[PDB]
Design a protein around this nucleic acid. Structure first.
Lengths: 325, 49, 45, 241, 336
RNA sequence: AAAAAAAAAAAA
RNA sequence: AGCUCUCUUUGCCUUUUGGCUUAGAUCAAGUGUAGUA
């Protein structure tokens, strides 16, 4: 029946010259790659049969058919040494690693426990873990950001955090002495301030602008650990605590007629009003006597463009960043 | 709040709900989110049903 | 959604499943349908 | 997930297996009223009666010749200790003996699995425990030594490894089924279920303290005991912090 | 409006209230031919706290192509640059982190030996421009040059036929590849160019557009010219019938180069069907246009992430391996 | 005035 | 009147639902997008 699925895949997906074609959409041939929820999935082993094999993974057998041995058996490798051929200075030191004594299940669980995370110098997608550090008060005043290296490379070229970017601002100061303008105003070159970011509130509803909406009601309040009762006998978590009844009680310490539903604007929009208005700019005088002085490829130049940015910015009058000196 | 709290004591126990229990939990959460519409529905049911 | 207004297609599938299955088997009849519970099919009948 | 009845029953059965593995020294207790004692195959664990839950838990803990591998790892790490300490004890050549791949779980008799050759006659003392201090050196001299390793899985009513090594030395030297070559030697004993260790036998001077340091090092840093402890920790799901 | 989050690193297409100037233009677009009426659906006091102008576009975009272009012009002092409105002080830090991860920049915030110049002049998203540079050293170049033609493309290839549901799946399965969604685009390009003889009605039965994808053909030609100016010779083996190289190694070579490039956009699929980042914090879902909407995978890369009304989707799903991430991102990712 | 197998782990 | 042809009608059951119990017992479900070109 391999020829039937083979030429059915050839007929349904003829132009697959890259990757692997999908199995055909038919009731006869199942879809192995399709994701069928979890409440629809079945527990199968490496061989496809529906059984378990561990004692702590829900099987009625364990090991090599209820035996702690193996089909290949065990053979103790030998060890001989003397003053002449001493073991410590031999070149082929076969070391006694904790993996000769393990099994494929042990290695599988070892790599299962070994997770993946980004390095300290690079930030990842969706990383939101600094709020607990920052929203702590005096605890967060000592724990500063651990120098993600983009901030460090901006630091090297002349940036200090707490202020924005741009050309340097020539404002004198504020000393905390109110708004005194009697200062000499000799105007040191400061750094531009940081404009804040934007954070739009999530909008899934169709509720309009300025609408408060209906407010909700809150529910009426609400050697560590133990050996479990089973993942299927946990039912509704009938056990919380035997020694006292109920949840944790939190305590205080004290004791033309317009359209229907539309109102007429009391004032017109100014922004549409300057469209037909004369504006606030008088046109130029234009005295008689002025005369127009001017009487009435890119790809090839880009190919010949040998101007590297070291020499491209030289004619642009820009100061290059300091390098390795 | 009291009515919904005593309705939760049966089924707020997490796990192994049938379809009607899940519908009840969805209805209770919907009533928690929008109390006024639920109260208007209840009063209409008392008047009419 | 489990529930909703009843359509003519759902009504005719309900009648056909009642024909094939009877009145004491509502879970099968609801299993022909998609948006209706056994109790809702029984109430509609 | 959609589970069959046997899979569901095994999944329900897992916490009982964890509870039985946790309480196994008092469940697989030596002092029983009745019960046919049977040795679990390829290990040194004696089961009294038929407890399938305890048996399947101990099969999961000891998968793939782990008793034999613990024995091999202990004898090899003692071999590297003796290899790095030939000079201080005048050891001529050290090798470990291998004909039977059955010695680890043989509780009837035993063999010798480490040999030491002496360039000069050693004035060994009386057979004494590993932590004895009242050493009495006698006039008898020897020219060869053996080291024997005995694994043991104890229980609540029998985990005294001191009496175990002493009685097994007094039993395993006068017995003719044991094939110990040299008349003088030392037998160490390792209780896996309680992580205990001891020895009984003669001592040429400079062996007792070396065996003490090597035994502490191998109890804290055995790869095979590390695999055993990690399998036990996964079986219990008892983590540290 | 689209707003690239600087801390997380995802876009957010969210429903922002309109600005005063935008609403004024919307009102003034009515009375063009005859005097009309304006029907803004909010109160008059709601047209009093609205923003006067829209949010600056330089403040809610990924600055990494912009910093790339600025260093291409030679202005490397992006901190001291005469911006019209300055971007806020930590968005370009994320941009510089992204540019350092994508080769390009050194430890001294400078555009490097022409690696950085080769990502500088290409009109591609710098992620897979980095891929296309790190393609020639590892063999295949023309296949992901084709994928580069397909990626730099806004309006989708498939004509959205709502009347066909199983037929759209079948014609998407006519060129389907299990090893990701990029190979499907490569397959449809090879079907159009090699055997299709540049014919539009064939695309009309295949539920595909014509103008944007022949534009993508021109884009592939332009990028081939651009890498011709890079000094690397072009290995066009697609016209040759030399199929003696095994295609499984070629496919994993293409996706291996892709995860050499796309190591930053890495995710792992969870049992409940959703995806999750390497940090394991934000919930991601497959976009309902990619080939892996119902398919099961373990580790994936995606071309771009966008936040809809509530779900955060990821596009162009491609299967990868975890050890590929641990091998080709040694300074970005580390195991425990 | 002193008590300790089976279901149930499936027909070239 | 009988014999044959076709049709109708009557009779016809021509294979015309192997048992029992707690109606034997239970039984929702992935996802599903698209400011701007």
């Amino acid at each position: 029946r391999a020829a039937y699925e083979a030429d059915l895949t050839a007929q349904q997906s003829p132009y697959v010259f890259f990757g692997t074609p999908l199995p055909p959409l038919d009731p006869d041939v199942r879809d192995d790659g399709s994701y069928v929820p979890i409440w629809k999935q079945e527990a199968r082993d490496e061989r496809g049969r529906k059984r378990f094999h561990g004692a702590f993974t829900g099987g009625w057998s364990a090991g090599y058919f209820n035996t702690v041995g193996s089909k290949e058996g065990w053979t103790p490798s030998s060890f001989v040494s003397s003053r002449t051929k001493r073991w410590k200075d031999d070149p082929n030191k076969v070391e006694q690693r904790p993996e000769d004594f393990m099994d494929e299940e042990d290695l599988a669980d070892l790599e299962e426990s070994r997770k993946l995370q980004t390095r300290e110098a690079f930030s990842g997608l969706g990383s939101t873990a600094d709020d607990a550090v920052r929203a702590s008060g005096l605890m967060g005043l000592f724990r500063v950001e651990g120098e993600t290296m983009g901030v460090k490379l901006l630091k090297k070229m002349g940036w200090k955090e707490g202020q924005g970017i741009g050309p340097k601002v020539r404002r004198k100061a504020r000393l905390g002495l109110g708004s005194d303008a009697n200062i000499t105003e000799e105007t040191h070159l400061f750094a531009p301030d940081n404009v804040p970011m934007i954070s739009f509130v999530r909008k899934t509803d169709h509720k309009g602008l300025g609408y408060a909406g209906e407010t909700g009601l809150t529910p009426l309040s609400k050697p560590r650990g133990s050996i479990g009762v089973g993942i299927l006998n946990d039912t509704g978590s009938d056990d919380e605590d035997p020694y006292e009844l109920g949840p944790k009680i939190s305590y205080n310490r004290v004791i033309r007629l317009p359209l229907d539903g539309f109102v007429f604007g009391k004032e017109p929009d100014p922004l549409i009003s300057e469209i037909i208005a004369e504006g606030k700019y008088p046109p130029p005088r234009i005295p008689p006597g002025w005369v127009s002085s001017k009487k009435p490829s890119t790809a090839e130049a880009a190919k010949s463009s040998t101007l590297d940015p070291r020499a491209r910015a030289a004619i642009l009058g820009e100061k290059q960043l300091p390098g390795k000196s | 709040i009291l009515a919904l709290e005593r309705l939760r004591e049966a089924y707020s126990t997490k796990g192994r709900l049938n379809q009607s229990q899940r519908e009840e939990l969805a209805l209770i959460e919907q009533a928690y989110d929008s109390p006024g519409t639920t109260l208007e529905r209840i009063k209409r049911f008392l008047l009419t049903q | 959604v489990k529930g909703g207004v009843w359509t003519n297609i759902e009504d005719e599938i309900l009648k056909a499943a009642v024909s094939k299955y009877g009145l004491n088997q509502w879970a099968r009849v609801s299993s022909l349908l998609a948006r209706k519970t056994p109790k809702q099919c029984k109430a509609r009948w | 997930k959609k589970l069959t009845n046997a899979q569901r029953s095994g999944l329900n059965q897992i916490p009982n297996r964890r509870f039985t593995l946790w309480w196994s020294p008092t469940i697989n207790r030596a002092n029983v009223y009745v019960g046919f004692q049977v040795q679990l195959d390829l290990t040194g664990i004696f089961l009294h009666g038929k407890i399938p839950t305890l048996k399947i838990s101990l099969i999961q803990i000891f998968r793939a010749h782990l008793w034999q591998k613990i024995h091999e790892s202990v004898v090899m790490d003692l071999c590297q200790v003796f290899d790095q300490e030939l000079e201080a004890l005048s050891i001529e050549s050290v090798q470990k003996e291998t004909i039977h791949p059955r010695k680890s779980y043989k509780m009837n008799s035993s063999c010798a699995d480490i040999q030491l050759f002496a360039s000069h006659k050693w004035n060994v003392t009386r057979p004494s425990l590993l932590f004895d201090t009242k050493d009495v050196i006698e006039a008898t001299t020897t020219n060869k030594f053996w080291i024997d390793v005995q694994l043991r899985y104890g229980d609540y009513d029998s985990h005294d490894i001191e009496r175990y090594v002493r009685a097994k030395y007094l039993d395993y030297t006068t017995d003719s089924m044991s094939l110990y070559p040299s008349p003088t030697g030392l037998m160490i004993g390792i209780d896996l279920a309680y992580n205990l260790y001891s020895a009984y036998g003669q001592y040429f001077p400079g062996l007792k303290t070396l065996i003490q340091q090597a035994m502490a090092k191998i109890m804290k840093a055995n790869p095979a005991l590390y695999v055993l402890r990690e399998r036990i920790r996964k079986g219990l799901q008892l983590y540290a912090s | 409006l689209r707003a690239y989050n600087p801390k997380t690193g995802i876009e957010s297409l969210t429903a922002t209230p309109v600005s005063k100037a935008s609403a004024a233009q919307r009102a003034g677009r009515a009375g063009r031919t005859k005097p009309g009426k304006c029907f803004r659906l909010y109160t008059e006091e709601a047209y009093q706290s609205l923003p006067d102008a829209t949010v600056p576009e330089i403040q809610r975009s990924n600055l990494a192509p912009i910093i790339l272009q600025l260093k291409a012009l030679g202005i490397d002092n992006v901190l001291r640059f005469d911006y019209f409105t300055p971007p806020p002080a930590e968005q370009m830090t994320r941009a510089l982190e992204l540019l350092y991860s994508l080769g390009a920049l050194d430890d001294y915030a400078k555009l490097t030996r022409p690696l950085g110049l080769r990502m500088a002049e290409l009109a591609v998203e710098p992620m897979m421009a980095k891929t296309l540079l790190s393609a020639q050293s590892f063999g295949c170049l023309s296949e992901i040059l084709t994928i580069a033609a397909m990626t730099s493309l806004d309006g989708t290839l498939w004509i959205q036929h709502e009347g066909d549901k199983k037929k759209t799946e079948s014609v998407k399965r006519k060129f389907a590849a299990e090893e990701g969604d990029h190979l499907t685009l490569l397959n449809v390009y090879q079907a159009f160019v090699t055997k299709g003889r540049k014919e539009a009605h064939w695309c009309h039965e295949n539920m595909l557009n014509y103008k944007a994808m022949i534009r993508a053909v021109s884009i592939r030609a332009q990028l081939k010219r651009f890498l011709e100016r890079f000094g690397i010779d072009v290995e066009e083996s697609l016209s040759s019938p030399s199929v003696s190289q095994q295609p499984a190694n070629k496919a994993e070579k293409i996706q291996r180069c892709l995860t050499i490039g796309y190591f930053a956009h890495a995710a792992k699929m969870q049992p409940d069907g959703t995806f999750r980042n390497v940090s394991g914090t934000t919930v991601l879902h497959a976009h309902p246009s990619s080939i892996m909407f119902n398919r099961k995978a373990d580790w994936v890369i995606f071309h771009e992430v966008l936040e809809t009304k509530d779900k955060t989707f990821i596009r162009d799903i491609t299967r990868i391996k975890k050890e590929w991430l641990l091998e080709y991102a040694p300074d970005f990712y580390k195991t425990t």
